[PDB]
Amino acid sequence: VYDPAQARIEAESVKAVQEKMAGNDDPHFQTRATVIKEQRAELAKHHVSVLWSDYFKPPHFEKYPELHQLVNDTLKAMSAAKGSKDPATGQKALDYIAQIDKIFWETKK
Amino acid sequence: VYDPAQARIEAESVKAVQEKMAGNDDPHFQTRATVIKEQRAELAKHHVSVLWSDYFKPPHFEKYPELHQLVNDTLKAMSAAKGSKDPATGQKALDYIAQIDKIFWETKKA
Amino acid sequence: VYDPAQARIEAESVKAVQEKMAGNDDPHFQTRATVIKEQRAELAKHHVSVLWSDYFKPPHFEKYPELHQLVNDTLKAMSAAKGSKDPATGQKALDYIAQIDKIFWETKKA
Amino acid sequence: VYDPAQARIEAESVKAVQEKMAGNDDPHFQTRATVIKEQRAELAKHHVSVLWSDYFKPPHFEKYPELHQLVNDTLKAMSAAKGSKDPATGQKALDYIAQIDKIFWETKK
Amino acid sequence: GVYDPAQARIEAESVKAVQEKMAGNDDPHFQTRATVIKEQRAELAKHHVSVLWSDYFKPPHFEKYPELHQLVNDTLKAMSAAKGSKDPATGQKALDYIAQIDKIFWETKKA
Amino acid sequence: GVYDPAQARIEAESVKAVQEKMAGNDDPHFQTRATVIKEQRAELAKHHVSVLWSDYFKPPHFEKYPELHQLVNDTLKAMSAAKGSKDPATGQKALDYIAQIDKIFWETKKA
């Protein structure tokens, strides 16, 4: 059922929207890309938060003690991106989702 | 950016919920699982629709004359699964999404 | 029960918001109206989609071979309106919905 | 922009779902029709509440003094229907929306 | 289940909090984000206020307090004005209105 | 804008309120409606608790209170158990957990 792919696609969409904000400076487009970035950001946050609450059971946290702070930093990096036009912040959020994805599949093997 | 993975994952939750409905008889669980199935089914229907309306542009409908119908047959297979406890109806929906995933990537490479 | 009135009313909010964007220059209002236009546009797109997936059954697609495309052209006309301040793009979307409303009722009588 | 047609279609859907609950007694269908009835009911309530807050301006209330309690009774009748399997409660909610619709069009003339 | 205007107050306190942050800044991005947040939080403030009126407040509450109907409407309208404005004063007018509904709320929990 | 666990508490108080109404009744319709409401309100309780953890609580709050991370996870999981159960005791376990996060919340508003 669970997959971090839903967090990736929404966060891949945040960076995509940020790259497009650089090559167009029209007020209407800027506003629209801010409305979509806020929605896609909160959705990415939800999917990451769900992985932490509903999937990762108590023995997983005893196995990877840094997981708790990682999920928090992932959510926080995504909130920074939600507030930024810089694609690097969206990529920081993607790099943070990749770390969770690595740990996620290491619990399916 | 789009990816039919969003539809598949939500459709995979439907078949998984249908299967959990056969190993438990408790009225409260049957009720909860029905609510969840109704939620993920309409979410899967949303993701399939969005692909069709926002991703798939006119050159794709000319290259794939069957695409229009494949999407409608998926949305209806998923509506069937939404009102069925049978894991097969959910597996039928997943198989239609698999046909959309194949066409999707053939338009991403070249 | 279904009715394309739900799509038309939300699409009518889009054209009305586009028109209000031409008589005011205030940055805050342009911003608010853009947010609202993005909201009602996707709501209109939802109502058009739901007609196509849940109401329109296979005998309708055989009777109207152009229905599949009419719905996709509406969803795209509405996506154009969503990213345009031009009242015409919103009126183009309303005109496509009007073609869906005509076909809708022809299948309700007989 | 505003139209009570959105409240009608959702409340016409509540009565429709209640009629179908009478001709089928299978636990799965009953649960599904309860999930759809709860959603369609809250949506009907929202559209009626919006007509009252966003459309009807202060001179309209000075013109029809019974409007305030009508909108409340409409919302309450719809909450009774949300809780009932009886189609008559859904029709009571529809009859109450018809009264608002009558007053609505009498403000457009 | 359980109702409380504290839900309406917090989403309405968010509208004023956003309007105060819009005064010291000028950045096209920050201004836009605040408007998106103000539109959503004001619409949520309007939902909670409407819920108390329909779902919580029963018919005798309308006889005992005849002013309640017009008060809830003026709160919802004040919250629409706050949604449309950038001025913290219109956001505070809605908090003043919610405070009045809050006073009537706890009076009925005593009844 | 402004955060408060009172949002999490009320949606979590609704879960227990629903579970108590499920005990005295047996009606197939009333039982179903309560389950739909319990699923929605518990999922909303889980949202607010998650929001406080990511959006409100900053990094020094995690150093000062090292137990916070596991507490929020156990609250979210306790709320998942309440969502799955009909017993008011599991709905109260989540209120006990939220009460602990509430204590830590007001301590940081003093800091």
Curated annotation (Swiss-Prot), chains B, C:
Q: What does the UniProt keyword field contain? A: Antioxidant, Cytoplasm, Metal-binding, Nickel, Oxidoreductase
- Enzyme Commission no: 1.15.1.1
Going by the record, the broad EC class of this enzyme is: oxidoreductase
Annotated localization: Cytoplasm
Assigned GO CC terms: cytoplasm
* Catalysis performed (reactions): 2 superoxide + 2 H(+) = H2O2 + O2
**Cofactor(s) it depends on:** Ni(2+)
Predominant cellular place of this UniProt entry's protein: cytoplasm
Can you provide one Gene Ontology molecular function annotated for this UniProt record? Answer: superoxide dismutase activity
Write out the similarity annotation: Belongs to the nickel superoxide dismutase family.
Q: How does it assemble?
A: Homohexamer. The hexameric protein has a roughly the shape of a hollow sphere with an outer diameter of 60 angstroms and a large interior cavity.
Q: What is this protein called?
A: Superoxide dismutase [Ni]
Q: Which organism is it from?
A: Streptomyces coelicolor (strain ATCC BAA-471 / A3(2) / M145)
What gene codes for this chain? sodN
Which portion of the complete protein is shown here? Answer: 22 to 131 of 131
